[PDB]
């Protein structure tokens, strides 16, 4: 259980590394999402102001 216990400690550490890595990718994704959902909300406000400018 000497290298059976070190072997479990190594896996546990590797498991921790991926969990932390996933939340860092989650945030990364969220920064791209802000841009996306923001890019749509601009052109909807664009098309209303074009419409009431053209009514005039």
């Amino acid at each position: 259980s000497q290298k059976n216990g070190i072997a479990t400690l190594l896996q546990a550490e590797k498991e921790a590394h991926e969990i932390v890595s996933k939340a860092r990718k989650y945030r990364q994704d969220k920064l791209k999402q802000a841009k996306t959902d923001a890019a749509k909300e601009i052109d909807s406000y664009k098309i209303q102001k074009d419409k009431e400018l053209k009514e005039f």
Binding site: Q2, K3, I6, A7
Partner: peptide, 14 residues
């Protein structure tokens, strides 16, 4: 530094 590698690979192999 060679011996603390020889005596700590052995501890993992045990």
């Amino acid at each position: 530094q060679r011996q603390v590698i020889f005596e700590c690979s052995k501890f993992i192999e045990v």
